Design a protein around this ligand. Structure first.
Ligand SMILES: [Mg+2]
Ligand SMILES: [Mg+2]
Ligand SMILES: [Mg+2]
Ligand SMILES: [Mg+2]
Lengths: 250, 250, 251, 251
């Protein structure tokens, strides 16, 4: 029981990485609310992990600012005060900066940046000063460290999350809020997105990309998140945790 | 004449750092168009540097997407094809993430992030494949490297610029566009903003902040920009240039 | 429930402070451990303080002793089976500016903090590759592997060397399918016996301009990220840097 | 118009490649320069190839020769006046994995690439502080000070050590108002005589998976960022890293 007593919100927790985070959190004794845009998918994902005594689904788009309040209230009414927020929801656009439409730019940033801001801001307000050993875990990427010529807007969003989380981490530390803020940086992981992009896994598995020569699995990200959520990581804040098969080491 | 033949757009070039960039560019033989929101201020700034044969003002807000096209066309009609873009325009908000209003968040990001995207995207389209030795210089900050508890949105914007510029730099390199993209990261510089924030220069000059014990001057940033604009830096792309009196070294 | 079932770890400088907590929690998680140290009385007592001889043993060794590393691996293998995990934690401190550093101080620090980490990494790769052990080499760097300190010149040099050299080793092992991962851990200020001996040290480290949390860490703070890195939980993490510093490097 | 008026620079390993171009452009910008190298015939010829004895001179010196550094400063001061600029560019290459690195190779590389940079930095601070010279110490790191290379273990270690040790020295000088700045330059792949001797080297380095621009740089590419760092133009830049690598580290 490494997350005994923890109560977590995992955005985009109905598929891939987010689903695995939710799975392993529940396994380690946390109570979890997962969010998603699709109710049928979301309800099924929750039940695949456990009963309503340990996990619940809430239909929510991370860019829905007002919905964030409903998300915290619903999670609190179900499991008690929230202790853990994982801002994992996000979308992918494959365009160069040159080729990015303004509509694409705005759409992606509204989820990947504004959504994380909404979750972090409200997270700090609701969890500070309550002695919860609170932890906000913001999902960046290797794309928050290095550029990719075909991921301009994605790059922008992940670099923004990377540094904005440090700001939040320092404010919470300096004010003795008992809230930690950290970023996780996955490399290429086998997810529904990757499976659906023809040729993606093949390009990602090249040694010039991922030195291990294969892409990761959603559990690879889940376990580092269990670490950051647990009181094991009580001295870790404002830091970057990279799980990428060596992508950024070369 | 280190910028002989260069033609530069400098956004927010009517005050502080941007004004100094424009000054030293003209000094080194470049033709310059500076932009600003205020016509009286802008016209006066241009004339303070030189005549219309070497520098001109164009009234423009960097978040005005359509205006970017007018900005390139006007600069080209005046001086010939643009070779250099310095995305320097930006605003400052002093709020923690916790305390940032959504209106403040959006306003700041629209200039500091969208504006830089607009300039970079159009810059690549207009300067690629023309053999101009083109250079796009995006103004980040030390705030693109480290957090500040009271600069949440600013942090987000500067981290976004930092990584998005790498994406643009790689795309241009891989496609042999003859366009380089780099970021400059000023520490604390004596600017109209700093002069106007009561107590700011004092806090900034603490040895725990800036190891040199004083803040910089706008020319400190101008000279690194002359370097990046010139063909001297033809092998430099996707890199970060920090001029900060030691702020990030500790 | 043991997170380190079947692992066999060598922890250098494991008789005190951070090294001791690493060994403690490693044994707690089902690993067998050999700790090293320069002083036998302290070391043997340290081993017994954690558990029985069936799970933890002491070996007297200076990390700069190249020949001794072979004995360390052989002795550990003979007691517990093939080594799966190496933690290069041993190191010394010198408080001098670059300007004020004697060459004797420079060489002595580097021989332990750099050469010793090299010896352990190199031999670790040779001895653990291709055995399917889920092998993990954990090199102790520091916040001083990221940022300078005006009064820690040689220390900075050693910690930055470890930071990047580990990436080289991580890449070679990955590219060769060696089943060895290499990562660095970067502690901030931790309450250790060294810190306890320096009067006022903890107070200075706890200033918000230094450590934003306003207090320094504890050895267990480093132990738990090392358990993560040692476990198969982290099978996709290699060549990366793990910082646990109370916010020191975030500002 | 000279950007380096009044400067007096020592450039180690300045008889070939990157070091030579640094010295060349330094003299072009009004500095007086002493270049060092291990071989006198090449070195004296290298000095004359740039300019007259009133602006550039050769001194035979191995950067790992600690005692020789004092002679280097004294000889340079006697010819041109107080030294204002030091470029620690000298270094050697070993192509071995960490696993395959002999300790002799490890020690030899580190003695030049690390110890030599230390000797120059330490003495540079002692000799140039408080003289109001606009002093600048420029330490040559590399892309290998940022990222690992599986076949460059010792090189990685040395270049990461230089990267962080320079920050320590930069901080101490800043905090003490020494009027000395310390910075690191990080070349990517550059067309140098070493590269020319390795058949196929340039071709491999020019692959887009390595250098995104699809070609490698030239020594002048490094010379011009060094001119910037040497000049009073960069009076607010210290403890920072300047990367000129054709995009190598951006991906
Ligand atoms: Mg125990
Ligand atoms: Mg700092
Ligand atoms: Mg010449
Ligand atoms: Mg890379």
């Amino acid at each position: 029981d490494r997350l005994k007593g923890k109560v977590a919100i995992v955005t985009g927790g109905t598929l891939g990485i987010g689903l695995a985070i939710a799975d392993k959190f529940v396994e380690e004794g946390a109570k979890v609310v997962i969010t998603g845009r699709h109710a049928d998918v979301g309800e099924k994902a929750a039940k695949s992990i456990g009963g309503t005594d340990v996990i619940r689904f809430v239909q929510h788009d991370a860019s829905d600012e007002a919905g964030w309040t409903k998300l915290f209230d619903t999670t609190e009414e179900a499991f008690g005060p929230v202790t853990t927020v994982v801002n994992n929801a996000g979308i992918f656009v494959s365009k160069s900066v040159e080729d990015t439409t303004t509509e694409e730019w705005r759409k992606l940033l509204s989820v990947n940046l504004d959504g994380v801001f909404f979750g972090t801001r409200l997270g700090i307000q609701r969890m500070k000063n309550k002695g919860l050993g609170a932890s906000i875990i913001n999902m960046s990427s290797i794309e928050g460290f290095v550029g990719d010529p075909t991921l301009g807007a994605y790059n922008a969003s992940k670099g923004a999350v990377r540094i904005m989380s440090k700001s939040a981490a320092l404010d919470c530390a300096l004010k003795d809020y008992d809230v930690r803020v950290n970023t996780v940086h996955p490399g290429y992981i086998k997810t529904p997105l990757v499976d659906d992009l023809e040729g993606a896994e093949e390009m990602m598995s090249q040694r010039t990309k991922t030195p291990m020569g294969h892409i990761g699995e959603p559990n690879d990200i889940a376990w580092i998140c269990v670490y950051l959520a647990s009181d094991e990581s009580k001295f870790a804040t404002g830091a970057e945790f990279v799980v990428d098969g060596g992508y950024t080491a070369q």
